[PDB]
Amino acid sequence: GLMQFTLPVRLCKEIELFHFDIGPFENMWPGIFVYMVHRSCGTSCFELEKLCRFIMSVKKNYRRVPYHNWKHAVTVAHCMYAILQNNHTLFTDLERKGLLIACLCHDLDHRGFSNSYLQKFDHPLAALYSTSTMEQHHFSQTVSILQLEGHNIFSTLSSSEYEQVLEIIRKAIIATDLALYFGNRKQLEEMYQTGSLNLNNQSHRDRVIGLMMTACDLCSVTKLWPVTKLTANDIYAEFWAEGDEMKKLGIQPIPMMDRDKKDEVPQGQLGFYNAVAIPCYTTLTQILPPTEPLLKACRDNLSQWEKVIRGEE
Template identity: 45%
Template sequence: MPSQDETVTRIPVETGTTVAAYVAVTKETVRTNNTSDDSRFPDGLSVDVQDVEFILTHPVLEVDGELVGIIELYRKEEDEEFQDEDEEVLNSYLLWGGIAFHYAELYTNMARQKKLNNFLLTLVSFVLGGFRVLITLLLLVYFQTFAQKLVDADRASLFLVDGNTKEMYARMFDVNEEAENADKTGDEATSKEIRQVNRFPVGTGIAGFVAQTGESLNIPDVYNDDRFNRSVDQLTGYTTKNLLCMPIFIRNRVIGVVQMVNKESGSFTKGDEEAFATFATYCGLALHHAKLYERIRRSQKKYMVALEMLSYHSICSEEEVSFVKDKPIFQDFTKLEEFTFPSYSLDSDEKVKATVYMFNDLFGSQKFDQDCLIRFIITVRKNYRRVPYHNWTHGFSVANAMYAVIKSSPTIYKPMEQLALFVASLCHDIDHRGKNNQFLMQSESPLAAIYSTSILEHHHFNQTVSILQQDGHNIFASLSSENYRKVLKNIKHCILSTDLALFFPNKAKLKTLIDEDSFSWKNTEHRLLAEAICMTACDLCSSSKPWDQQQETVKGIFEEFYEQGDAERERGKEPIAMMDRTKLDQQPSSQVGFLKAICLPCYEVTVGVLPNTKPMLDGCLANLEKWEAIAEEQKNKNEEATNNASE
């Protein structure tokens, strides 16, 4: 490999150009003293050499006749021209030189095979005894360092195939020594490494072609290949010249693609292909076992969650169904459609009967089995935990708010959409533990190991499906299979949208549509956005209730916050002020911030698509005014206490 101070001249192997190129093609020795007049090589010499008159160009061949190089000798005008004797002497030397090249290559191949064997032995030991660190080891250590050095490549890429989406994604992309050194020194400006997860359809680009066909590709000039995607080069400023790309198989199925880019000297050889093919085979085994371990780990976590659920919850009995059916009612359920209905005024069983009333009022009592409906609602109630806020009362309150929204605008949502919205509202916080997603991740909860995003929300939906699958609980049994699928899909969308992390992008999209007067109920995506924002509005409905209800709910909210703060402090982490029970004086200002940052923007956008929900916006504004007054009063008290302490 040339040093940094050396200049490397590359010439194409072809006739009709230079002397060296001609000899490389023909493997003939050439003696000449007037290259400018020779039609075989009109471009003369391949290198710039001064005062050259006589030239002797000789091919360097291995024992098997394969060309490994060209040697070119020069003499000046005052010297003698090359004779047959010179050619014979040179040929003798080059005969031994070819043998030397051959043995040098054998030694290089043996050394490379030794490194490959050592790598495979190490990899196998991890496959047999250390699944837990395998995927990290493979991607971050061996693939990064060994694979590149094995074939003398500048960069390395590993793409995995997602069989469900028929897409490929790069867990590690374009790793090179320059980027590795930059990471060690913290100099991000010199790093060209791309660590983001890139997804693209199978069949796209060279890697996609290899994944689709299962064929290996060794391409000496990628810019002359129509399959090459130049966008990455354009993005990074890096220039890809040649590459070696091979599929990773498991049971005759392509699960990934490994790709080496830009061999440091020349192009990738047959020897590189053979060595890399062995490497790719063992990569496949390693990835396969890593995926098996991940499945086992996820199954264990799900089993832990299931045991926890069984110890906490149960399904309803027939006695409970009969008791609720026979329970006398002392409430006027017609007031349920008012946005100001006090949810806490009903006891637990009355909430079940009120839910039955709302469900039948919206969808008809003749279409759904009533015992099944009661059984479903009671089991949903049982699956809400006895936590200060995210409990059965909250679930009922959100369902009641959605009922009021639908009743206020009965023709906006389609029947199947109304069904999904109401059931999603009722079930949206099933088995909530009184802790947020961030806490679950930081505490390494089994749930966090199962779901990578919207942890609680995914769990709430899956628990809803689990209840529907219990005997005598499937309230959707009368629906056609197509409507059943649609409702479940829509329920999932609605429950996931209650994750406040999704609220902000949803609100921004919907607000833009409203501001530009481009929102349309005929557009499916627009309808889904409206459903999502409506779910959030109902989830936050306590902020729009009359002041006495608002105060009652806030007590539960902050008690749940404080319990999480206590748990964080036990784990050695200082909780934020909102969750710190030693900072009760900051409750009013926290409420002001919450109403201004989340609740008001949510209701403003909701009213933009559902004007009849304006009572929720008005209620929120009224509560904000009261909280601001309390916050100002608390601020004055704090300042007075500070002044007294300083005197």
């Protein structure tokens, strides 16, 4: 009960900032996550013995893919930690518990391929789940791990609290399907502008939590330039492998996944910041003003990609 996790002074300070990088020491990532749960939620939210066993089963069920790996999971959880810490009073006890676990589990058992590739391959998961294929799998994998003996970190919730937290995690993980982000942000934009946005409205909260999930999931665009630039290599290393597999199925991939079109990456990143990232963190900043540093970091990175195109790097 009286056993805190403590971090070295530089990590203790920088972990509070949106742009924190969790570093190349894998063995420290479980401690970083527990640290965040204790500060965000309390030292009582979870049985430490059970939380530790859950974290390591979750780690074990992420694969050794270039980007959609255990580091991504912890990175996405840290961004949620930063949003929750900067918006103390806006979130319930249950929401704080659920969303950090959701972020940790949101890409469980990812194979480094898109929903599109699963469908064109005719993968069994695409028969089991016709939309948000990988995201329904990620939620399924979360529930499985929660049902391992000694792994139910929610055991001490009431029946109804338990059903609510699993329903928060399910919506949170489904919302990381980027195909659903565009419609969710349009709706949130309309509600904010016409003044109808109401955080006591469960369907409105759901939408806001969905945008938070997209913002945390894309947070590589909100880091210092060198982190953003090196993550982009991991992201394209998966896409190009998927492009290779499309060619094997006798389908030309979209340029994004065709390693023959490496040259057009800087322009591809521009389109993505303008079409997805900037609108995401803009609408998020409108709804939750203290998340503005994510928009400011994203804009700084948009400018770095502009410099790359102009041949200044």
